[PDB]
């Protein structure tokens, strides 16, 4: 179906969850997979293992497109992200670019207070 | 009558109106008996980042000594004129004449 043959893997690692979205070069999503949607709810959805099985599961569900090349775009910090791109070249993809696209303000908005734990 | 360095980008699609504008601007300087020291037309140069997207734009370096009033109306001329995007006028750093 529609046979795009090149895409972008936007991986959005945060501290609590990694969410991998495989799209095309136009930016239209072709299929996604989160670490929290792969079993292991909770303290286990923020691990490199959960991110890699999230990326394995996002490599599935884009078989209908015949993607061979993809760029990787990485957001946020997280226990994910590093393992995530590994799972992508464990799934036959030719990984072309690895950009880190974490949003950094140039002293913009005030961050929240928190955490007197 | 103090020194100024004017640069300004021009929309690429109005590049053919560039030297005319230059003349008018220079004419305005000579309206106040101020003199113009260098003047460079840097061609359509590639922008390091997009602006209204609009890549490659046309740069003009000026380096004029003038009284501040004609520089001020030159700034308002750069405000209203839709052709010119990003002017920048600067300091004295007394009169220069060289290339880069």
């Amino acid at each position: 179906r529609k046979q795009v043959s090149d895409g972008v893997a936007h991986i959005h690692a945060s501290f609590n969850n990694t969410i991998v979205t495989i799209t095309d070069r136009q930016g239209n999503a072709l299929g996604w997979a989160t670490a929290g949607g792969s079993g292991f709810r909770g303290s286990r959805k923020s691990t490199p293992f959960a991110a890699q099985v999230a990326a394995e599961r996002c490599a599935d569900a884009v078989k209908e497109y015949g993607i061979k090349n993809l760029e990787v775009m990485v957001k946020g910090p997280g226990p994910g992200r590093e393992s995530t791109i590994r799972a992508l070249n464990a799934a036959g993809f030719r990984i072309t670019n690895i950009t880190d696209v974490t949003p950094i303000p140039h002293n913009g908005c005030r961050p929240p207070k928190k955490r007197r734990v | 009558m103090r020194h100024y360095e004017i640069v300004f980008m021009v929309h690429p699609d109005q590049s053919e109106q560039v030297p005319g504008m230059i003349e008018r601007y220079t004419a305005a300087i000579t309206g106040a008996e101020g003199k113009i020291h260098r003047l460079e037309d840097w061609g359509r140069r590639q922008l390091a980042y997009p602006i209204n997207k609009l890549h490659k734009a046309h740069y003009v370096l000026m380096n004029v000594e003038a009284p501040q009033e004609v520089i001020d109306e030159l700034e308002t001329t750069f405000r209203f004129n839709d052709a010119v995007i990003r002017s920048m006028v600067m300091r004295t750093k007394h009169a220069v004449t060289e290339a880069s």
Partner: protein
């Protein structure tokens, strides 16, 4: 350093992602680190240099 239009020189004194390099790395006596940075910023306004590498 004194000048901002020489973007070869300025491009040496900047990292691969558009950020100004500290004088702790490049030597550059503090007076010229200040002129340097201020010239880098005047150049980033003119789009001679980039603010970042994700524009």
């Amino acid at each position: 350093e004194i000048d901002y239009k020489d973007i070869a020189t300025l491009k040496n004194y900047i990292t691969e992602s558009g950020k100004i390099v500290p004088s702790r790395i490049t030597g550059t006596r503090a007076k010229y680190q200040r002129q340097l940075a201020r010239a880098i910023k005047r150049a980033r306004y003119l789009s001679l240099l980039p603010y970042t590498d994700r524009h």
